[PDB]
Design a protein around this ligand. Sequence first.
Ligand SMILES: COC(=O)[C@@H](Cc1c[nH]cn1)NC(=O)CN(CC(=O)O)C(=O)CCc1ccccc1
Ligand SMILES: [Zn+2]
Length: 956
Amino acid sequence: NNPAIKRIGNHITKSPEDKREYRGLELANGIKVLLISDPTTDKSSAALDVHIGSLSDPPNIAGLSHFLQHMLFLGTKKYPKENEYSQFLSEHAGSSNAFTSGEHTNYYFDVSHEHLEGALDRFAQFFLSPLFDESAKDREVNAVDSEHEKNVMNDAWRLFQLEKATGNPKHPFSKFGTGNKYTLETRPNQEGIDVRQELLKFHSAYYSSNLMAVVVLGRESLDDLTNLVVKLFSEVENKNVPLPEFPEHPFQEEHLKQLYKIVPIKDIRNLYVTFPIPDLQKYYKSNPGHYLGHLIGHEGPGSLLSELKSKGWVNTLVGGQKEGARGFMFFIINVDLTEEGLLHVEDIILHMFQYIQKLRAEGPQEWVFQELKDLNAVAFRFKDKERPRGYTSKIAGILHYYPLEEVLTAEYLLEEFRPDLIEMVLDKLRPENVRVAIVSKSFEGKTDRTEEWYGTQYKQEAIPDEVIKKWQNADLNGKFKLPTKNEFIPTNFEILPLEKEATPYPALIKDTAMSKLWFKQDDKFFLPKANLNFEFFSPFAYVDPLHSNMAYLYLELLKDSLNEYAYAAELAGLSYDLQNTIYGMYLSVKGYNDKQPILLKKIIEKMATFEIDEKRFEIIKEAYMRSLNNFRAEQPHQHAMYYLRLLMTEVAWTKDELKEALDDVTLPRLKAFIPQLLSRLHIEALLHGNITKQAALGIMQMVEDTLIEHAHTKPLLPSQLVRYREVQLPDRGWFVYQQRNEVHNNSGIEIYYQTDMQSTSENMFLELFAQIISEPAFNTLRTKEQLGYIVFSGPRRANGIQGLRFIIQSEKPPHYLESRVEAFLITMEKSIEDMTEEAFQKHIQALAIRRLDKPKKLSAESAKYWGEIISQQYNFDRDNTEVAYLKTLTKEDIIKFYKEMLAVDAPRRHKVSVHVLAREMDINLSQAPALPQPEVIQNMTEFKRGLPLFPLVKPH
Ligand SMILES: COC(=O)[C@@H](Cc1c[nH]cn1)NC(=O)CN(CC(=O)O)C(=O)CCc1ccccc1
Ligand SMILES: [Zn+2]
């Protein structure tokens, strides 16, 4: 029948709740393809995943395949304009990214449903005939440098590369994947390399159809999608590349029984234990590493972590199999350390080996396998519908590992019980096979070695044989038991029939002094799941830095106390989130609705009768202390956002104020605060999902009754429901606040042009403006001017007020970044004047689609309502209202707006700038306007005191 297609392949197994339709196939040139038809979708999407990545970089050009990934976006033969692809997505409500791992390069986009073909045609050109323009290459090489720079002082990245640096140095594993200006420009020039050629050469060599999978998701039929994919992808050449394989483990004998002592950037204490294992991927139908992961990483009674945490040695643990590449994997067990734990690392590892030994002694357990199989089956059956862009990206990666027919199920379904494989993996978790890393600031000064790409400081030792031998003779230890049946496993999936009184938006079904209950029975998704959100108000949670600290610790203590019991709930797809806010606390319980009341009842009950174990108190207080200190090591752009938040909010305690007040938090003082906090509250709740009104009222009243029974709670008075205001900046003012980041050698800037209170029309002026400037801000400040990797723009909403912000992290100083942004704003007014009426309407259409995009799953719909409730705007039909209004706007409206509120000589410009300086300070380019001298903020309190505050926004 069809020369262009090798194979069609059978029905693709899907959940029976999945109304989308699917066709797998294989093109003549080798491309594995999944087509997904969703006739209701708002965005379409596609992804392409090439089975090549940085493990295949040339040894003399670290980061080449990552760099290539950047360059594919910057023009092809059919679409030579550098930003054709970006701007097309932007004008049709889409977005795109890409990533490169050791074996893959993965490219995906979404777009408005009726412009799939447009988007896909541009996308296909990436794989056919990229330009790699010489001038683009010179520019983009900075963005890749900047990306690396952002990672340099991050502990996760450093450990990630330290591991690669300590295996076999001639194994591809040890390569440097990101690349930087040095590896991608400086040194190749020094060595006579034409990088445009090396990119042409690599693309030509590795971008072979036989190494590619594609997924496309759209409203079209399967037949129409098929024709489409054949049309744009049959022409990719098959150069028949063998798939790279790495049968030899980068950790050989010389790499085993080694100890590493590493100095962190942040003040953290961790121990990483690693064993090399073979590639388990081919055993996916039984998944022996998941079985052992489930056991070793367990957190219930009888578990490894239970005992380490009781000895006061660790607070958290992670264990299980870790991806390597084709040919090798790892098995890891990593824990954080208390100060005691740091001195007992040897005993910790013995306990690990005792627990593994217990697994050997009891042997593989079919009922445990049975449990995971069941959980996986229920999860698969009732999986949330995914956002298109993530779904295609994720399936494109897995098309390389699974038969077409299984790609949806493979990662979920379990079919084979394999005590042999389990035994075989257990036989590698042995002291003679072990690598041990200790990350601690106590190693400062004591190290003698330095990792080349990140500068990490470490020491490497043989673990002494006395130590191996002691671990090899690990007896059983009776504190360690396998877990018992998981009683939280759900079994009731009945979907309650939709009630006669069901509304499309949440309804206020209870409005008392104690509690305000918003409710909606799910009428869209029909999965046996529910979301229960509660905001608890207490003035005592933020009355001062000390109380804030206590609110925090109280909740951390509570979570830590519930963990053993909650963990079973989590494996059963039932979880919770519990945190202190500047208003009091937030509690959310999400998941299968079956056993939800039980978990929820337990939490409130513990909350109200809580008894603190003081060793837990002391460990958590110390972790929190480190945690506040560690803020100093966050990125300059985060610092900028943090300072602006502190400047524009009526009330806010700084981390310094918090750390200072922390020494005063005693056990006595915390026991006193808890009943104080719970004595008067107000509760506002959204209960949303597979539940009825009457079950909702029941749950609300149960939460209330428990607080009353156990903590005597009474109502707050309507007047004590303080929501905080934003600072109101003067017409034509400009304020700068400046700080130094002490760890990172970039600077950060945030610029905020405050506009006015939120409301239908102020909202849409800002949003439309943001839409129009979005891609060009990126295209100009990043792609042309190459000011940094991080370059953001868009609305700021806080405390009912709003405005336009830019964020940039750069090597260049902030005074300079200011001026490039102002230069950019002029370029924007000129281009709004110059654009066609129709280009104008496309932006409207594009924002329109963004706003009207239906939530694909329960919790996305909850989040939307929840934001209407926490903001106290309660505007559930906001998207229709605001989109109706948006369709009436014109170029004259936006030009006016820009001229009123935004332009440099705007009558109502209100500008504030946070400059975060790098670790050590004290052309083709458009003209930047002359700026006024700013008012430099010296003291955040004086500043606020000296300014009006805005009203709060009226409801409805
Ligand atoms: C089945 O395996 C598991 O149950 C858990 C282990 C665990 C410990 N405590 C609670 N659960 N999860 C994992 O092992 C998770 N896995 C990550 C993932 O699921 O994507 C990993 O092992 C990777 C850990 C890692 C290493 C380095 C940097 C980031 C993350
Ligand atoms: Zn990148």
